Symmetry: D2
Subunit: 266 residues, 4 copies
């Protein structure tokens, strides 16, 4: 006779958990996560910003890389998120306990973060992480300024209701670089059509493709580097093959249209 | 020499606080609030739904009117909201403590409700009420069903980010009546253009006028009855002069355009 | 070269997950959990109370057993907890989404429940579950009444800060039965002396042994049945060997004193 | 005919709202609130701590006084509280939005703070303020260290369940000064005996008198300065008449015994 199943751990490809040393993207912007998960540190004369943290077990590695960059825990002022799933917001709660960092996020992301990814529209309770509270709620198009770096929120609902692209301007070789950190546009295993928990899912994705296509975007980065053709392990060539925001949006839309057609058939 | 000012109470016109007996709108739908604030009770064989509660001091009156209708505290199953300002969601926290009711709301409304209306985009902390937590988060177009009455959420952001119209079909004289409880479309004292806390405010209002115009709408009701030309004190004629949803949206848009032109001049 | 470790699932002995049919304890009190985790249903003419839910994956089984007892989801009015660890409060969030149930708990338990067991004083983030909010905060000695069954909270901090014994009087063979659901008194792997996160841990445990010893206690039940010598699989003899509250407190204190002496040596 | 009453503002004696310039208590400790409400700034080489903020309208004044002391908003690292009523925790939410400050509090205080003082055990919803979330939960006797100043929490439940005395050691004229910031011990209009929302109220107060009596206490300060015979407007003599912790506890207990005897008679 038969017990209920044991809880299943959220396991991921090893490369998503492979620590790397900081990789510079522009004068004040560094990739400090793992080989296959983005976590961006932006260092300013007035403290540091982190965009995403990756998986829940990455907190100590992130703090190690911050220290290597000259950022102590007090100096971390702000955490921003692409979306509040466990592989991107995983260590946010712990980072808040261990640093000076406060979280800014939109209402949708704040609600999902506050329940630790539980009651997900598509995953249920299958992929959870430690819950965290947001200190500031942002609206679409709102700006946050740290040490003179101006971050702009661009809502791009679909992958989660609260999915956000964050843009800012850094410098490189003397010139401005408009960086776009665009969120995921995948729909992994999602019911797209007639989903009772997300009735306008398709319309939202279509609007989000258009938003991403139009972002100020000299350099695109994504939560999974492979989605934008980054290879964080390739050193001086890590970004050489990166997609434009236009190409990223177009590729995501073509994949999405294929998934819709497969869903209608299946 | 000069102390800081005393806190100012949120005071309103007396008619907003004038209790009235239940006024029937359709076979299962009643106005149970005050003369000038809507609070709608929908009674089903499987429990009751409340849409809005009015001001914070209205909890006991609402419970009195529910009892008069045959609804005990256990029978109240669900509270829905137009928007989470103090004159519409005021008594929600107390109603939850005193009844079986759970709250369903969108993420924006849930966040504002959870802070008791504090840190409002336009009012700051000037108009607060007891905070309450939402038990269910709804997405645009999602349905909630109680005792066979199907309520549909239609997001109409503007007055607050989380403003929602709720629609359902009741019956009257043997025939279906498509009831639309459309939220406020006012912008009282708001900075409309270039508002850093709400950069897309104007676009959202314009989309919301179009949403309201298109609602299924045999009978329109609004949080302030006068906004839809209801007179709750007029008895058998209370709804005689009510606007259509199309006329309500058109009047709100004309007022909004006037306010924009005045803001540009002022 | 070496990736960070994968997340580890919270796995438990199979018997903790082995469904059982409802086992009657007294006229209105039933064990409805698994062979080795207590979840008590108390059925009243005015709805049902659940004390604990067990592991997170037990929600559907609990609802199955409630249905077998004549308790539909609307009829479940109240969830009470021994303490907010994953093997006792695991399915509370899901039960709230799927039933009419509201949670009453003390402040300590509410705070831990709201973070899903994360940032535990002793376990860190190693044993988490879906977070849930409390609808009512109770103080020590406060009573909650459902359908004429009066439940009294007796704080017994130690195993967690918010650990609580719940007592009530049922009937059996015509006579009153004072039931005591006393919380765990274990300290599994805990640093007892000089713990910076719990400086008064030892004093709290000692006071809690005295509280448990003095409870009104014709029948003792515990979150792990074996702690009170219950065998839920033994049918008509399931409770035959149960400890008194006095014996349970004495055995817990002797174990605790042994652990203290081992900690001093180790 | 008769409308429901208007909401009543929480108004206080003018002296509670009378700004004062910073008054030094010891080498790193300053009173920066108003004439009749304590708000203590402790400045360290590693940032500043605030103990209490006073009334909700005091945020800007507090920030003015911090700036005068050389403390910018980024430098404020920690807010601690005596208890979470509106005249002591009033501006905490706003201070969090406007500074780097994180809140540490016990579970009881965190729960009350998170509901903005609503559903108070004795005041109901009559005295509310903007809700705020705690970033760290502290246990009795736990220490928090900022820039080498060690703050110790001493729970003294009664006035609120979460009432806390905070102690630390500063210096003055070359010598250590053990400062005790002991919470209120009043019971204003409280039902003391047989209170269903606080059954152990009397026992808690009695234990709290003993806690206060025993604190390390070269200098006592209290949330209302008059309770410890401080006169913040008396300049160089402001603290001359201050009570010892022993005298404060004794006076509070004598008042409490008188109130008990009056309650029995009334
Ligand atoms: C299932 C993935 C995971 C998931 C989530 O967050 O939804 C978490 C909960 O496991 N993250 C994803 C995302 O898009 O963020 C999805 S798609 C994945 C990334 N892929 C690539 N293929 C080639 C270049 S990268 C496929
Ligand atoms: C200032 C109003 C108030 C406010 C809010 O909620 O914003 C609360 C916080 O005081 N509620 C309003 C709403 O639109 O809901 C606004 S407009 C008011 C209703 N009016 C009518 N004129 C004629 C027919 S009704 C003017
Ligand atoms: C490690 C156990 C577990 C743990 C917790 O809640 O702390 C969760 C997080 O895995 N639950 C326990 C409790 O006391 O509740 C502890 S002790 C366990 C019960 N035991 C018995 N031995 C014989 C008769 S029963 C040993
Ligand atoms: C009613 C007071 C107020 C109240 C609270 O916090 O309970 C808030 C909500 O208005 N604060 C108090 C406290 O003890 O903190 C109580 S007693 C007050 C202070 N008194 C003195 N008399 C002489 C020297 S000071 C009488
Ligand atoms: Zn995702
Ligand atoms: Zn992902
Ligand atoms: Zn409003
Ligand atoms: Zn209004
Ligand atoms: Zn436990
Ligand atoms: Zn256990
Ligand atoms: Zn007080
Ligand atoms: Zn006070």
């Amino acid at each position: 006779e038969v017990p209920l199943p044991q809880l299943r751990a959220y396991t991921v490809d090893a490369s998503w958990l492979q620590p790397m040393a900081p990789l510079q993207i522009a004068d004040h912007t560094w990739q400090i996560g793992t080989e296959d998960l983005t976590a961006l540190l932006v260092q300013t004369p007035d403290g540091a910003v982190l965009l995403d943290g990756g998986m829940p077990q990455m907190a100590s590695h992130l703090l190690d890389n911050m220290k290597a960059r000259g950022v102590t825990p007090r100096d971390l002022r702000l955490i921003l998120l692409s979306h509040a799933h466990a592989d991107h917001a995983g260590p946010v709660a712990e980072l808040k306990r261990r640093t000076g960092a406060k979280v800014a996020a939109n209402a949708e992301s704040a609600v999902l973060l506050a329940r630790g990814g539980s009651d997900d529209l598509h995953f249920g309770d299958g992929i959870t992480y430690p819950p965290a509270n947001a200190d500031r709620i942002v609206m679409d198009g709102e700006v946050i300024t740290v040490g003179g770096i101006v971050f702009t929120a661009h809502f791009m609902a679909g992958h989660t209701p609260g999915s956000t692209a964050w843009t800012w301007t850094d410098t490189r070789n003397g010139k401005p670089v408009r960086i776009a950190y665009a969120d995921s546009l995948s729909a992994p295993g999602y019911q797209l059509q007639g989903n009772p928990r997300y009735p306008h899912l398709i319309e939202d994705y279509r609007r989000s493709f258009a938003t991403v296509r139009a972002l100020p975007c000299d350099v695109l980065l994504t939560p999974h580097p492979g989605a934008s053709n980054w290879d964080y392990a390739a050193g001086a060539r890590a970004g050489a093959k990166a997609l434009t925001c236009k190409a990223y949006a177009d590729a995501a839309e073509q994949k999405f249209d294929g998934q819709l057609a497969k869903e209608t058939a299946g």
